[PDB]
Structure formats: C-alpha cells, structure tokens
Amino acid sequence: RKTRKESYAIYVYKVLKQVHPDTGISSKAMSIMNSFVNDVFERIAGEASRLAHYNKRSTITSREIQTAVRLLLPGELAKHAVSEGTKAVTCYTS
Amino acid sequence: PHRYRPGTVALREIRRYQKSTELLIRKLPFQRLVREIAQDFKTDLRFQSSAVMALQEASEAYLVALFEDTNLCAIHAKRVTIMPKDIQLARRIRGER
Amino acid sequence: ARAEVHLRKSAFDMFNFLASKHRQARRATSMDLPMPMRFRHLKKTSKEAVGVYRSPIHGRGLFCKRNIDAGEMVIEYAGNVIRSIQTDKREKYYDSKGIGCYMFRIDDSEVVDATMHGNAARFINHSCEPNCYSRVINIDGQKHIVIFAMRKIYRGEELTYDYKLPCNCGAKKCRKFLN
Amino acid sequence: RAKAKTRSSRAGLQFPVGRVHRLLRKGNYAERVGAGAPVYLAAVLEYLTAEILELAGNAARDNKKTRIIPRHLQLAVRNDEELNKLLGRVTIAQGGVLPNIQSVLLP
Amino acid sequence: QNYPEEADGTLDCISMALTCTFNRWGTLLAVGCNDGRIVIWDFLTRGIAKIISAHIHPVCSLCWSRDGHKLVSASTDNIVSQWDVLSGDCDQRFRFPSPILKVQYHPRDQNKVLVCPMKSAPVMLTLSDSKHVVLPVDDDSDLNVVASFDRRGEYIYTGNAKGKILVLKTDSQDLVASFRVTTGTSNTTAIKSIEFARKGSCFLINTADRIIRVYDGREILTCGRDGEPEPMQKLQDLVNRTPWKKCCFSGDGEYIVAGSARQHALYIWEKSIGNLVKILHGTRGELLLDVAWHPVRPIIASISSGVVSIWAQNQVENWSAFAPDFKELDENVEYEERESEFEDEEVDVTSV
Amino acid sequence: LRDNIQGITKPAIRRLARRGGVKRISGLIYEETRGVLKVFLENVIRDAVTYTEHAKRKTVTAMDVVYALKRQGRTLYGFG
Ligand SMILES: Nc1ncnc2c1ncn2[C@@H]1O[C@H](CSCC[C@H](N)C(=O)O)[C@@H](O)[C@H]1O
Ligand SMILES: [Zn+2]
C-alpha cells in the first residue's frame, strides 16, 4: 500500500543493456542518472518557453526545441544531437 | 627646460580619467571589427547603430573589471608592473578558463 | 648525357620510404590513473603524435611532432609474437636475404618480430644516451611492449633506448659493444 | 478498436513519449505543446544518456569491476572536455577529485 | 564506397557560374555562365578544357547528346543552336515566343528535342529544319505545362498546371495512362519538374507543396488510363519546412538526393528503405542554384554564386603499396606460418 | 579583411588601464588584450546571430544583444 512514484530506472536499464551487454548498475548511480535526466529536461524546456514568449507566439513546436538545443549545448555535441533528433522525427513522420 | 619626474603625469591621468565618463575606443575601427567577425557566421548582415553602441559598452566594462582584478593580483605579488601571467591567473581563478 | 653507365644502381632495400624532405596532465596518458585507461588512449595518440624521417646516425630516425611531457607513454612496439627457435631460422633466412634483425623480446621464452608484421615503431635506434625506457604491463594477461619517456622532450628530437659492434651514438661514456 | 502500437517504438526510441508530453502539459511552459517536440526531446535525452553511459561502463570494466559505483561517473564526466564545459557547477555525491600534483612541489 | 561525406575543395576560377549538366560517361561538365560563357573542365586531372563565349546574353538551359558531341543553347533571345565538341560553332537560330525554360533531347535519336515554354504547351522540334509537332494537353487553361521523356524512350510524361498527368506517345499522341494524386485535403497543386533514373523505371514527383513522391514506370501502365495509384515512397520534411529547387538520382537507382532552396543543404534518403540517412552543409548564407550527381562515382557538384563544390569521399593514404609484403597490423598478431617447416594461349596485348 | 584587430590602437589600452587604475604597463598586454577582446566578442556575436536567424529577419536589433548579455550573466540597463 504505497503511492506510485515516477522514475527512469527501466529506461536507463534498457539503454545500458543495449550499449553494454554485461555491466550492471547499482542504486546510487541510478539515482544520479535520474537526477541528471530531470535536470537537462528542466533546462531545455525553460529555454524553449522563454523563446516562444519572446517571439509573440503561443506554441512550443520542434523548431524552438532545436533553437534551444543549439543555444545550450557546446558545439560538436550539439552538431550530433540535432542530427539524432531530426532522424527520429523523420522516422516518426511516415 | 623642464621635465617631470616620471609618475606624476601617470597619476594625474588616472585622476582625470576616473573623473569623467566617455567612450575610449574610436567607433569606426570597432564597427569594422564587429562587421569583420560577424561575416563568418552569416553572410550579408546589416547592423543597426544602437547594437554597435551596446557591444562597445559591454566590452569596455568587461575590460575595466579585468584590469582592476589584475592590478590587485600584481600588488599582491609585491611588484608594480602588470605581467600577462597575472591576467592568466585572474582569468583562471574567476572560472572562465 | 647517354654516356654514363654509372654505378649505385642497386638499393638492397625493401624500404624506399626516404623522401626528399626529412623534416626534423590535461590528457589521460600523463595522469596517475590505472594502466589500461592510459592503454586505450595510447593508440589514439600514437597514430599522429610522432613521425619518421631521415637521421644522420643510421638512415631513418624518429622525430616526434608533439611536445611530449615526461612520464607518459608514447607508442607500442608490436608485431608477430614469435616463439624461440623460429628466431634462428629467420636469422638464417634474413642472412640469406640481407635484411637486418628486428627482434625485441617480451621475455626469454617468446620474442616479438617486426620485419614481417608490425607498425611504425621499428624506427628507434639504439643509443647509449637515451631519453626513454621500456616496461611491460598486464592488459588482461596479453602483455605489451610500450615505451615511456624520461625527461621533457621537445619537437624535433630522436627517441632512443638501450638494447642491452661500434655504436653510432657518440656518448660521453660509450660502451661501443652492444653485447 | 484494433491493436494500438505505442509512440515509443513507432519512431524507434527508448525513452517514453506520452510521459514527456504530460510533463510539457502539466508545467505551464506555454499554452499549446506542438506535434513532435516531445519526440525530438526524448531523442536528445537518449543521446546524452547513451553518451555518458558508454564512458561509465568502459571505466567500470577497466577498474576490474562489474557493477558501477559513482566514482566511475565522476571520472567519465570530468575527463572529457565537452561534458566538463556543460556540467560546470555540479557536486556528484561520493565523487572525489582528479589526480593533479603541481610541477614545483614534487622533488 | 557509397554517398559522400567531406568537403574536398572547389573550382573558384570562372566568375559567375549559373548552371551545370553531365554527359552519359561522367567526364564532361559544361557551365552556362551569367554572360554566355560555356566552360568545360576535366575531372581526372581537373583542368579547364574549353570556354565557349557564345552569346552576349545569359544562358538558362543546356543539354548533352548521346554521341558525346552535340549541345543545345538557350539564351534570353530564345536562340537554340547546335554545337560540337570538336569545333564549337553556331548552327541554328530563330525566335520562340519569349519564354524558354528547359530543353531535352530524344534519347534514342539525336534528331528531336523537346522544348518547354512558360505559358504554352511543350513543343517538340527536329534538328533537320524548323518542323514542330503540336502537343495537346488536357487542361489548356493556364498552359503552364512541363513535359519529359522516360528512360528508354517509350512515352512522354507531361505535367499540367492543375495536378493531372498525361502519358502520350512521341509521335501519334496516344493518351494511354493518366492519374490524379490526392494532394492533401482540398487543393491539387502543380508540378515543378519530373526527372528519371538510369536503371529501371523509377522516378519522382516534385510538387509545389514540398512533398516528394516515388513511383515506377510500369505500375501506371498497368493501371491504364484514368487509374489511381499509390506512392511507392513518400518523402517530406517537417522541422524547417524545407522548400525545394532541384531533384536528381543516385548512381544505379540506389539513393535519392535533393538540394534545398533555403539553407544551402543536401539531403540523402534511401529509395530502398525510406529514411533520411545523411545531412550535408556548406556556406551558411549562400543561395543554392544547381545540383548534379556523377553517374559512375559518388560526386555531387553544387553551384552557389559561382562556387562549385565537389564532395569527394576524403580518401585515406596508408602503407602496403610501398612494400606489399609487410602488413601493417593493429595489435599483437601471433601465429605459426607453415605446419610443414621446409600455357601458350595467345592473349591479345592489343585487346582494345 | 585582415586588419582592425590591430586597428584597436595603443594609447587606447593605456587609457582603459588608466580608467581602471593601472600605474605601469609592460609590453605584452597589448596582444594579450587583443586576444581576450576577440574571444569575448565571438561569444556574444554568435548568440546574437542565433536569435536573429531564429526570429527570421536580416538585421541585428539591440534587444538581441541585450538578451545574449542577459543569458551570459552580464545584464545591461539602458537600451531595453
Ligand atoms: N648505433 C647504431 N648505429 C647504426 N645501427 C645501429 C645502431 N644501433 C643499432 N643498430 C642497428 O640498426 C637497426 C636500426 S633500424 C634503423 C632505422 C631504419 N631501419 C632506417 O631506414 O634507417 C637495428 O636493427 C640495429 O640492429
Ligand atoms: Zn655509438
């Protein structure tokens, strides 16, 4: 008899078992990765909201998420992440 | 035939420049510098004038703050003249590098 | 002009690499970290850190193209890990062909070939005044021949070590006998 | 009325999409959340998590270990240049420092 | 190898380049400049071959011939002239009604060319004289009609100003197939340009509402006259909303490349699976004009204000050509080599 | 273009230092100051052109410079 808690344990677990087929992860590193995912989500959503408020709009499209990622991440990591996102949107499209 | 002992003209230049407020960099070379390093990020831009003024204000305030902290470091090192390793120490302590 | 049947038309060299030019803790490999962490980044450094050009001692030398700091790895000397009596058959074979011996040993049971298979680590001359040395590590049992440094080395210097015939080093206290 | 394939594997991803769209509705970031913005954002989060877990698992193997303890995450973040420029002001618990002795101290 | 990845130089010699096209073989590239200059390079040794300063007027369209000798002119005074790679002289000259957009030879005869005006039906002529065959189009309302041959030379696919396709025969005008595409919800929109492959019968539909559709040159003949086919593959973009300017194909019908019109970009899809696989870039603020794919090697030529960039795979040098008996290994390769320790057939040397 | 990093003259760094309170200056501060100023202007102008091309215009208004300075952490009062 407990109230449910949102988490990210299973998803980190899945990506870890894709990229390393043997190595397990303890409790504390799981808590750290949970906090890291929440942190980057807060930064990107906040910057996109401030952009869409600046330009006299009312809608967070994908274009504002692209401009927020380009403003926030440093250089080469942004150049990879933009292409990963565009590949994902194109596969979702058709 | 009279020449001052060296230092007095430096001190009165310090007082005379800390008195008033003006702009200390000529605006045509600074404007050409801004257009020059803006050329490589997007071709054929078109600046307003107040944006150039804002960049000049921000750059001048940043340089003055850097020189004050550098002179604090150099007076700590029991010297007078600023060396560039003092600038590098100040920029490494502040966290920008 | 068409009157010179002139000599020096034989090379006896399979390596005609020599050209006209002959130009002479921020990272991981200089840390205090455990050894395989440096051993990974070894190969990402050694493919572009150094170079091989002509030297006055014996043909081609090793002039590095990066200011190496003291204490860190440089490059691995790897090849065919031969076993100890094929050495003598290859001595007879390369005596028959006329190409010198390139054989460093990990231990006194297994030697490592370089002439048949290897890398650019063959261009390290012997000298009695070195600035590098050698230690064998244990990357999961599969041991290696990796070369550290000794002092602060700048851009444009030959790298040597002791192999333990008159030598062409010209040392201050030279032994002149490589046995 | 038929089977419903999810929005997590219709794009070939791993992080959820409905949960991200709920967190963009229940936050008042703006009025009207767009069409594929949570898909784009979940792909970005996947890429960053894979990027850090690669170095984490590699260092965990290289210290002769099988599980992961946060010292490995400390090393994997503070070794690289780009993640050190991103995660500037962050204290990982149980983290530890990087070995750095100066030039003039040791004899 | 495959699709290109790296920048690999340019040819910034000739001022104000405007258009470009290839031959069948992939060694001839003429450029109609901003003043009538027609310049050919080399590709193996990359030297400027022949400047043809033909007109005082700029050139907007060109085409190569099957023998590798003949070209065709399109100036701003409607002049269509027959050229040669040996002499380079003017043959034909007359005036159309004022707009001329693009020409195209017949594939299996260098007698006939297909010429397209703006506000008229496309017209086929010969090269013997000024004979012209009137081609009928179904609408005949706006007369903004595009037309092109197929690959082998069977039919002529035409595209109106309203969104209906006719399939006619090259001489007798046999309407044998037609189809209307369900363009979105309400409006059926026009077609910019339709181009055709070299292996098979696949082609593309380039509309005016920024959606690329993939079709075959046999399914429409199977559906006959007034049928409803489906797109074999839909290609579009959503993020930047991506207007298009130029479309062409890959080497042997493997991939599809399409240059953009806003961000100076090149996109590479797959006709096989159907997903985008690589994005290219370049100068941020230029204006992309003409894109040509190289038929026997992965090279793409892109004109953006004179500059012709050649993405050419960035080859990597190594050993083992110097001493082909030494193998440059990567790690420790230990083994033992030998388990056992120690005719008059006249082949033509002139086989050309 | 090549110059105008050297077009910033050399009483001007002296006058900025004597607004800041500097007595005696060596002979390397000139090139060091040119380098520092070039780095800072790059890291402002890049975000300025980003906001410009996102807004779909072809000029650089003052508000974009104020926004880039505001995100860097150096707020400017006097142009908004
Ligand atoms: N001091 C020295 N002077 C000349 N040769 C030496 C030497 N010390 C060792 N040698 C021999 O020279 C070889 C070095 S290889 C020399 C570099 C390379 N082969 C070239 O093209 O020039 C070793 O195999 C060793 O047997
Ligand atoms: Zn010697």
Curated annotation (Swiss-Prot), chain A:
A GO molecular-function descriptor: protein heterodimerization activity
Localization of this protein: Nucleus; Chromosome
Parent-protein start and end of this portion: 31 to 124 of 126
Subunit record text: The nucleosome is a histone octamer containing two molecules each of H2A, H2B, H3 and H4 assembled in one H3-H4 heterotetramer and two H2A-H2B heterodimers. The octamer wraps approximately 147 bp of DNA.
Family: Belongs to the histone H2B family.
Name the UniProt record assigns to this protein: Histone H2B 1.1
Glycosylation sites noted in the Swiss-Prot or TrEMBL record: 83
GO CC terms: nucleosome; nucleus
UniProt PTM comment: It fluctuates in response to extracellular glucose, and associates with transcribed genes.
From Swiss-Prot, chain C:
Motif (WDR5 interaction motif (WIN)): 1-4
Subcellular location: Nucleus
Residues of the SET domain: 48-164
Resulting phenotype, residue 2 to A: Loss of interaction with the WRAD complex and WDR5
Coiled coil ranges: none
Outcome recorded upon mutating residue 77 to A: Impairs methyltransferase activity toward unmodified or monomethylated H3K4me
Residues annotated as transmembrane: none
Modified residues annotated as S-methylcysteine in this record: 101
Record note on what altering residue 91 to A does: Does not affect methyltransferase activity of the enzyme alone or in complex
Entry binding sites for Zn(2+): 128, 167, 169, 174
List of residues binding S-adenosyl-L-methionine: 58, 60, 102, 125-126, 168
Reported impact of residue 86 to V: Leads to stable interaction with ASH2L and RBBP5 in the absence of WDR5
Site (Important for WDR5-recognition and binding): residue numbering on this chain: 2
Post-SET domain location: 165-179
Disulfide bonds: none
Source superkingdom: Eukaryota
Name of the featured protein: MLL cleavage product C180
Organism of provenance: Homo sapiens
Gene name as annotated: KMT2A
Interval of the full protein contained in this chain: 3764 to 3969 of 3969
From Swiss-Prot, chain E:
Modified residues (Phosphothreonine): 242
Placement of WD repeats on the sequence: 12-53, 54-93, 138-178, 186-225, 239-281, 283-321
Quaternary structure and partners: Component of the SET1 complex, at least composed of the catalytic subunit (SETD1A or SETD1B), WDR5, WDR82, RBBP5, ASH2L/ASH2, CXXC1/CFP1, HCFC1 and DPY30. Core component of several methyltransferase-containing complexes including MLL1/MLL, MLL2/3 (also named ASCOM complex) and MLL4/WBP7.
Protein name: Retinoblastoma-binding protein 5
Coiled-coil region: none
One GO process term, biological-process aspect: response to estrogen
GO annotation, cellular component aspect: histone methyltransferase complex; MLL1 complex; MLL1/2 complex; MLL3/4 complex; nucleolus; nucleoplasm; nucleus; Set1C/COMPASS complex
Keywords attached to this entry: Chromatin regulator, Isopeptide bond, Nucleus, Phosphoprotein, Repeat, Transcription, Transcription regulation, Ubl conjugation, WD repeat
Protein localization: Nucleus
Function: In embryonic stem (ES) cells, plays a crucial role in the differentiation potential, particularly along the neural lineage, regulating gene induction and H3 'Lys-4' methylation at key developmental loci, including that mediated by retinoic acid. Does not affect ES cell self-renewal. Component or associated component of some histone methyltransferase complexes which regulates transcription through recruitment of those complexes to gene promoters. As part of the MLL1/MLL complex, involved in mono-, di- and trimethylation at 'Lys-4' of histone H3.
Curated annotation (Swiss-Prot), chain F:
Gene Ontology biological-process entries: nucleosome assembly
Modified residues (N6-succinyllysine): 10, 56, 70
Chain positions found as Phosphoserine: 26
Residue positions, PTM N6-glutaryllysine: 10, 38, 56, 58, 70
GO molecular function, one term: protein heterodimerization activity
Tagged with keyword Nucleus: yes
Signal peptide: none
Modified residues (N6-propionyllysine): 10, 23, 56, 58, 70
Cross-linked sites for Glycyl lysine isopeptide (Lys-Gly) (interchain with G-Cter in ubiquitin): 70
Positions where N6-lactoyllysine occurs in the chain: 10, 56, 70
Annotated compartments: Nucleus; Chromosome
Residue(s) of cross-link: Glycyl lysine isopeptide (Lys-Gly) (interchain with G-Cter in UFM1): 10
Cellular compartments per GO CC: nucleosome; nucleus
Residues modified as N6-butyryllysine: 10, 23, 56, 58, 70
Modifications after synthesis and translation: Demethylation is performed by JMJD6. Monomethylation is performed by KMT5A/SET8. Trimethylation is performed by KMT5B and KMT5C and induces gene silencing.
Keywords (A to Z) from UniProt: Acetylation, Chromosome, Citrullination, DNA-binding, Hydroxylation, Isopeptide bond, Methylation, Nucleosome core, Nucleus, Phosphoprotein, Ubl conjugation
Sequence positions bearing N6-acetyllysine: 10, 38, 58, 70
Residue numbers carrying Phosphotyrosine: 30, 67
Modified residues (N6-(2-hydroxyisobutyryl)lysine): 10, 23, 38, 56, 58, 70
Protein family membership: Belongs to the histone H4 family.
Subunit structure: The nucleosome is a histone octamer containing two molecules each of H2A, H2B, H3 and H4 assembled in one H3-H4 heterotetramer and two H2A-H2B heterodimers. The octamer wraps approximately 147 bp of DNA.
Function (record text): Core component of nucleosome. Nucleosomes wrap and compact DNA into chromatin, limiting DNA accessibility to the cellular machineries which require DNA as a template. Histones thereby play a central role in transcription regulation, DNA repair, DNA replication and chromosomal stability. DNA accessibility is regulated via a complex set of post-translational modifications of histones, also called histone code, and nucleosome remodeling.
Protein name: Histone H4
